[PDB]
Design a protein around this ligand. Sequence first.
Ligand SMILES: O=C(O)CNC(=O)C(=O)O
Ligand SMILES: [Mg+2]
Ligand code: NI
Ligand SMILES: [Zn+2]
Length: 331
Amino acid sequence: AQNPNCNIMIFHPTKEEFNDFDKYIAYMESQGAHRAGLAKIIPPKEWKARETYDNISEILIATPLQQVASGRAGVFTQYHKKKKAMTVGEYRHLANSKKYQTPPHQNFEDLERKYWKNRIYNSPIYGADISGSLFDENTKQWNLGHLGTIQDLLEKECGVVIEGVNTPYLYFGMWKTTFAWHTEDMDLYSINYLHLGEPKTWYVVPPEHGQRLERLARELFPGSSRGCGAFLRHKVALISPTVLKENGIPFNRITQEAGEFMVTFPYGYHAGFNHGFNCAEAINFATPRWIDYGKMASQCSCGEARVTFSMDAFVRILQPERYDLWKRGQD
Ligand SMILES: O=C(O)CNC(=O)C(=O)O
Ligand SMILES: [Mg+2]
Ligand code: NI
Ligand SMILES: [Zn+2]
């Protein structure tokens, strides 16, 4: 079995290997990459996403979110407070202000120490889930707006034609902006491209060990667990690497820099934080190997998780027994 320790693998495709997206994912999996839950892909030196990022300041962040924490430094939740709209240029100035800017630090490990020590004492502001793309239409390789759709994959594998669409989303981050422990909707893959700015540090649990993370989370967040048998779908809970190690949970970490792609694999729990002002693009995708994970994905039916239109068909076709309860949680 390839990659039995579930290490995060880093790939350097050539320009020729960068042509066929599906084929390269299947290649990475042939080398065991999915066992980690996360892989990094460094694009060939000849590739670019677009010509420049000099003209993005007028994009609107309609509903910036202030991420307010509660708990202790290593075990906390966050809630999202809505703020007034602002442009990307206004958000960048805010990220760089004395109140929000990255502190002085020696290296990525020092900054990670500072994040876990001090995150809860601040409330950074995040632009999230903004439908759109920064890939040039003429970028033919790994263009996250031109991927094969999840609805087409389900039709190809299973024969069922369904409604729904699959488009990318932009993220604008600052120092201490935080992504809580989660798997993707319907335990899909994700791909994330860091277009510009400062890094993102990721934490990930191997898919084969995801239930260990879920059991710790029920212990650490006991009222949330009584409220919902899939409360990690709410995307609010954080657990530090130190707490994970104290509890024996297998995990890995890596820092993504501008110009790099990350792929998350089905049922790979992940979390992380941004180092400073940045912009990322991400989208969910599927392969044939996903189908069996989609059929088994947990679901939130308490009402908290609320998701896109296109998830309806995935539940309806893959999880007909669960569909009526889940749809009630959507309404
Ligand atoms: O960049 C982000 O904020 C979040 N992205 C992810 O959790 C992802 O691609 O799975
Ligand atoms: Mg603009
Ligand atoms: Ni994710
Ligand atoms: Zn729920």
